[PDB]
């Protein structure tokens, strides 16, 4: 492939793959490669709302928001108690 | 800090979103706590060929997640392939 760089991270994973399940593979070659740039910010709120009706209580939210990109998403939302 | 108009805005985002998605019926009061933690790196997918011994030939499904402003690499799976 030429790419030594993706190679070097191919081998890598089967030598990982192999330290964890003595698969006892051997690297032969790269196929196909994708590279997914991440970047970005997770957030980590706890939060005080008010319920219906009247009760006052704390969840834990968790918000993923990319920084180069508009795009954020609630990760997850559960009571702290 | 849990004063920052930028990081309440994003917790009023959170509850919107928790009501949108399952009727929850909540009102955002206050924000009481903050954590920022930030996300940097390269999700590696690729398909590997292997030899087993076997000793035939397959292949293979990996993800190798890699931060850049950090020497950090980890295999995230490896999933064989038909
Ligand atoms: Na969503």
Known sequence: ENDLEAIELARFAVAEHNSKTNAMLEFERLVKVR???VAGTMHHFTVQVKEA???KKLY???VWEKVWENFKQLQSFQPVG
Do not use: F, N
Request: glycine fraction near 34%; charged fraction near 20%.
């Open 53 to 55: 009706g009247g009760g």
């Open 35 to 37: 590279h997914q740039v």
């Open 60 to 62: 834990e939210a968790k």
